[PDB]
């Protein structure tokens, strides 16, 4: 399944995922395409922050959902 | 771009607005000219229904960013001229801090030789004795940065900025501008990287004009190709500079636990 | 209301000359344009002839002809600036940049034949090498200010004060406190004004066909503070 991740730098990345995927794995896939380290990533979906150790379906994220990526330099 | 070639030289400009703010119905007409080569816009406006029931400075941003000068190295970020001549729909909500808001919807497009801007504006929740309906804004304008971000999924732009309106008593009334622009045609359009337009304005009066009116001069230059960029919280949609998003989010996520 | 007043009924061409020294960096600027007091409008182009301007262009806007303000009819008895023409006035300032150095300026504003001429000496000291001025951290833009005017009887002129807000690269604001005095050059009678202010607005821009360090400046100035 495909989902999108929208950055504040007006950029849309489309991603290949399964609902069983952990947030940490999704962050890894983001790193894999954009080079951004997982620990600088905060992911938001319908106003909630996605937590490491949970899954795309723990938040009822389906195909074609849009996530919001906010970067956090340090302290992440 | 193709639209781009239309903006060498002086383009005549025509502005029309039908407004309704807190019930008060009004109309404004304007005309002058735009010269993208310098970034220079000159316009004169007449309230044709008589006395403008809001202060002229609050309508400044409502009354053609296609006139900005984009420098050579940023000409591929100029969405406004690329949507020309079919034009674009410009929409805003403008929030006057601790007072009402305007929603605006405009079509900016060529009609033959002239670039026209036609606007419908609806204003609600204003205070009878606020800075807007009480006419407490000075008749002047400051410089702003207009922050632009692509919105691929709309095939257009999201634009955000805050206007600083000086008040007669020395305070400053803020107006948060949440803007987006969409092409009217299906022509291709330049979708830009984050940047800003540097905006400066001066307002005056034609001393042989007894009607209620504004002369406006604008200088606009694209720049900025970032921690100052005004972005929206993905939780509550408020705009703030990028530098503040992390600490805002720490608090905002906890405030809206259901999102 | 004064003799000087009639000199300003149409477009008056303008010449600016500035000799400058800031923390030892010496510089010159020439400028030219026209003002139109009927409308309160001022247009000017300045060229730094010694190379690169060693201070940001906007710090010099106020230094680079308040004789071009539009005084409304019921305020024309308060126009010190035209009343002193054609012989002119001396305009003197100290400008204190917050947390940084200061400018001292002395300028003569007067008609040379039919052009309005502004000749200025500027000295800057105590500037920080990595500060907003010497470090060129100012945005290339300008805001509106009210310029407060008081009569100065003993020196047969005016005292003026205001603060300019200069926007910085990083989104902060840097204040420049202006202390100003204007003193007639001639012996002639002049109008000493009741308290009022000039409402000022400016826009800075570039001539894209100019290759020297330069500034295009548009000013709109209108006297206010006294009711019609
Ligand atoms: Zn929020």
Swiss-Prot record, chain A:
Annotated site (Essential for function)? 68
Q: Record's superkingdom?
A: Eukaryota
Its subcellular locations are: Cytoplasm; Nucleus
Looking at the UniProt record, the site noted as Interacts with activating enzyme sits at 54, 72
- Cross-link Glycyl lysine isopeptide (Gly-Lys) (interchain with K-? in acceptor proteins) maps to 76
Q: Which intervals hold domain Ubiquitin-like?
A: 1-76
Q: Which residues carry this modification: Phosphoserine?
A: 65
Question: Which residue numbers mark the cross-link Glycyl lysine isopeptide (Lys-Gly) (interchain with G-Cter in ubiquitin) in this sequence?
Answer: 6, 11, 27, 29, 33, 48, 63
Q: What does its PTM field state?
A: Phosphorylated at Ser-65 by PINK1 during mitophagy. Phosphorylated ubiquitin specifically binds and activates parkin (PRKN), triggering mitophagy. Phosphorylation does not affect E1-mediated E2 charging of ubiquitin but affects discharging of E2 enzymes to form polyubiquitin chains. It also affects deubiquitination by deubiquitinase enzymes such as USP30.
Modified residues annotated as ADP-ribosylglycine in this record: 76
The job of this chain, per UniProt, is described as: Exists either covalently attached to another protein, or free (unanchored). When covalently bound, it is conjugated to target proteins via an isopeptide bond either as a monomer (monoubiquitin), a polymer linked via different Lys residues of the ubiquitin (polyubiquitin chains) or a linear polymer linked via the initiator Met of the ubiquitin (linear polyubiquitin chains).
For this entry, the protein name equals Ubiquitin
Its taxonomic path starts at: Eukaryota, Metazoa, Chordata, Craniata, Vertebrata
Q: Which gene encodes it?
A: Rps27a
Portion held of the full protein: 1 to 76 of 156
From Swiss-Prot, chain B:
Q: How is it modified after translation?
A: Sumoylated with SUMO1 and SUMO2/3.
Q: What is the effect of changing residue 234 to A?
A: Loss of affinity for ubiquitin
Q: What is the effect of changing residue 257 to A?
A: Normal affinity for ubiquitin
Tell me which tissues or organs this protein is expressed in. Answer: Ubiquitously expressed.
Location(s) in or outside the cell: Nucleus; Cytoplasm
Report the outcome of residue 235 to A.
Reduced affinity for ubiquitin
Query: Result of mutating residue 253 to A?
Result: Loss of affinity for ubiquitin
Q: From which domain of life does this come?
A: Eukaryota
Residues annotated for Zn(2+) binding in this entry:
233, 236, 244, 248, 252
Q: List the disulfide bonds.
A: none
Documented effect of changing residue 254 to A: Normal affinity for ubiquitin
Consequence the record notes for mutating residue 249 to A:
Loss of affinity for ubiquitin
Q: Where are the zinc fingers (UBZ4-type)?
A: 230-257
The record's subunit annotation is:
Forms homooligomers, possibly octamers. Directly interacts with POLD1, POLD2 and POLD4. Interacts with the N-terminal domain of WRN. Interacts (via UBZ4-type zinc finger) with monoubiquitin and polyubiquitin. Interacts with TRIM14 and PPP6C; these interactions positively regulate the RIGI signaling pathway.
Q: Into which family does the record put it?
A: Belongs to the AAA ATPase family. RarA/MGS1/WRNIP1 subfamily.
Q: What does this protein do?
A: Functions as a modulator of initiation or reinitiation events during DNA polymerase delta-mediated DNA synthesis. In the presence of ATP, stimulation of DNA polymerase delta-mediated DNA synthesis is decreased. Also plays a role in the innate immune defense against viruses. Stabilizes the RIGI dsRNA interaction and promotes RIGI 'Lys-63'-linked polyubiquitination. In turn, RIGI transmits the signal through mitochondrial MAVS.
Annotated domain remarks: The UBZ4-type zinc finger binds ubiquitin.
Q: What is this protein called?
A: ATPase WRNIP1
Q: Which organism is it from?
A: Homo sapiens
Q: Lineage, please?
A: Eukaryota, Metazoa, Chordata, Craniata, Vertebrata
The record's gene field reads WRNIP1
State the covered range within the intact protein. 13 to 46 of 665
